[PDB]
Design a protein around this ligand. Sequence first.
Ligand SMILES: OC[C@H]1O[C@@H](O[C@H]2[C@H](O)[C@@H](O)[C@H](O[C@H]3[C@H](O)[C@@H](O)[C@H](O[C@H]4[C@H](O)[C@@H](O)[C@H](O[C@H]5[C@H](O)[C@@H](O)[C@H](O[C@H]6[C@H](O)[C@@H](O)[C@H](O)O[C@@H]6CO)O[C@@H]5CO)O[C@@H]4CO)O[C@@H]3CO)O[C@@H]2CO)[C@H](O)[C@@H](O)[C@@H]1O
Length: 642
Amino acid sequence: GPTKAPTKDGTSYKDLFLELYGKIKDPKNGYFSPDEGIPYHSIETLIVEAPDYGHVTTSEAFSYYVWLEAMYGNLTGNWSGVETAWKVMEDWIIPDSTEQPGMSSYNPNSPATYADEYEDPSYYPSELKFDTVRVGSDPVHNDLVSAYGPNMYLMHWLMDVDNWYGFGTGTRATFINTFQRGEQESTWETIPHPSIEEFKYGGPNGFLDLFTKDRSYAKQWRYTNAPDAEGRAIQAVYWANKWAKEQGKGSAVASVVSKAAKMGDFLRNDMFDKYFMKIGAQDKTPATGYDSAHYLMAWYTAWGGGIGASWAWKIGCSHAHFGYQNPFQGWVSATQSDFAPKSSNGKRDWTTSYKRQLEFYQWLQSAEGGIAGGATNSWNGRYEKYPAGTSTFYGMAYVPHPVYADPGSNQWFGFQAWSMQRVMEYYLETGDSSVKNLIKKWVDWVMSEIKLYDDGTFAIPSDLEWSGQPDTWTGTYTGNPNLHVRVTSYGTDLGVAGSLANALATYAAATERWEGKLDTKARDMAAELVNRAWYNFYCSEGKGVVTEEARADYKRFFEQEVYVPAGWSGTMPNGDKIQPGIKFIDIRTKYRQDPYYDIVYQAYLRGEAPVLNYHRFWHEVDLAVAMGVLATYFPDMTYKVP
Ligand SMILES: OC[C@H]1O[C@@H](O[C@H]2[C@H](O)[C@@H](O)[C@H](O[C@H]3[C@H](O)[C@@H](O)[C@H](O[C@H]4[C@H](O)[C@@H](O)[C@H](O[C@H]5[C@H](O)[C@@H](O)[C@H](O[C@H]6[C@H](O)[C@@H](O)[C@H](O)O[C@@H]6CO)O[C@@H]5CO)O[C@@H]4CO)O[C@@H]3CO)O[C@@H]2CO)[C@H](O)[C@@H](O)[C@@H]1O
């Protein structure tokens, strides 16, 4: 576990970042795959939260990988890493032409076939309804195609890097997916499956009839993006471009800038209702134009087609979470010459989008200052009428916990830092005035909740509890006196601490550039967080920083039942039997050979939470980048033991 950093007082944040960078990139540490250089979720394999295995990769991890190299370039002058990062990304996690066969057959007038979402995984599979549901049109596909070709240039969210699930050939990296079955399907209640479905495993129809009930079943591929990964990546490329041109080295990143621009154009797919229904309809009214556009970054876009015969479909998402917005990236593609969309309409849509997102944050801001969850255009996932007294935002209903309820998707304080960091960069770069009150109220709140201790430790909010509703959006912030957030627990999360330090340093930099004076308190708090995360969680084996966490939730390894429909039967690539009655561990039987299996299992027997040490990729990067931000805007600042 953790031991104190030996670091000398007066070490520059530049030098600290260079130390952490070195450790993240050292092949002996094992942050990246040995064969292809893909960044794993974490060094440890036994870990369950969003991904359910440590040696998956996620598009998230890649976005952080790009961010890290951007900062490296800034501090160092060597830009090759940014190119390498983006190469690995397109070689592996972006589906190429050969992996989206006959996407060319996609029809904008009939994007997809409607299906309900339900409040429990037991209700699934969900029935596809070519019957009685007319679906809206896709107003974006044509001008995307016209600029780019038939294919989708987005990152699929999840990939099994060393094929630990077995769905793939030999040891190759394989697209996989998990979440399918509505709001009550946590990480613990899923059935992992390949994205390219060849019936090679599972039941007779592979895994399909587990999730979506069709009249007939055929071999198909499907993908899902998590747009916050794309936002982060393009955001990183903006900085890579800016910093590189300052050095007279813009040519080293021009191709990546171009790819990032394209990527940004495609994120437009994330702006529409799941089935292109009218925003605010409270009904399954198909939409014709941009009437289906909420103009926010929804939870996903997903698309697929047949492997055999050629056909295709695409969905947006009706659900929107504040934690997924990126008004900064929005603003980059809307206004910045080098990131101008090739499409004829992208610049205009993005211009609408970023402003629209900036209003979202404002609408969601509780009376205390933290940002509430979000909003939906399809109540209970089936476009029902909104309950009486439901406050709205351009027609969408307020939801405290968009998409997931176990745990509620806005319980995690991490989103506050992640999401408002972007708003800070936006204020840094525009001096936009309309956003000043949002930012200050949020900073005030966060400053009131950070705990510093005289022994040099720290604590930050971990879990949030929400009550009430925002007032209905009128174009203007009311103060939401009846929307409340309460911090219910605190911890020592290293990525979240890095992320929040970034936000405070960036904000501080922004007050210097645009306001009467530098916000000295925000700047100093950024430095405290970084000092304390590094001093207190240093890894003496040289792997960077390292967490120590009681994972009570790990009892679900052995206690959680995974719904399988009665009568359904099938097998994982290693024989593990998929049938009604199974627990998490039953379909992930290889876990028993994990170095940390004994430890978590013995803690199960004795009825106690096991204690884990984790080096997550993104924890290390969020901390490193925070250091790099201090190095960039406050180059005289200098580490000291806290
Ligand atoms: O016409 C010719 C042939 O057509 C066939 O019929 C087609 C039909 O035309 C077409 O409409 C249909 O497409 C549907 C698919 O069947 C179905 O798979 C798809 O389901 C979606 C589902 O609606 C959606 O909610 C779900 O989203 C998941 C997502 O996959 C998952 O990745 C995501 O996880 C996120 C985590 O929550 C988050 O924490 C993490 O950070 O990021 C992740 C997001 O990146 O969670 C979401 C939900 O929360 O995805 C699935 C797809 O994966 O819906 C389509 C339309 O309804 O396909 C049919 C074929 O199957 C006929 O079969 C044939 O006869 C004809 O010849």
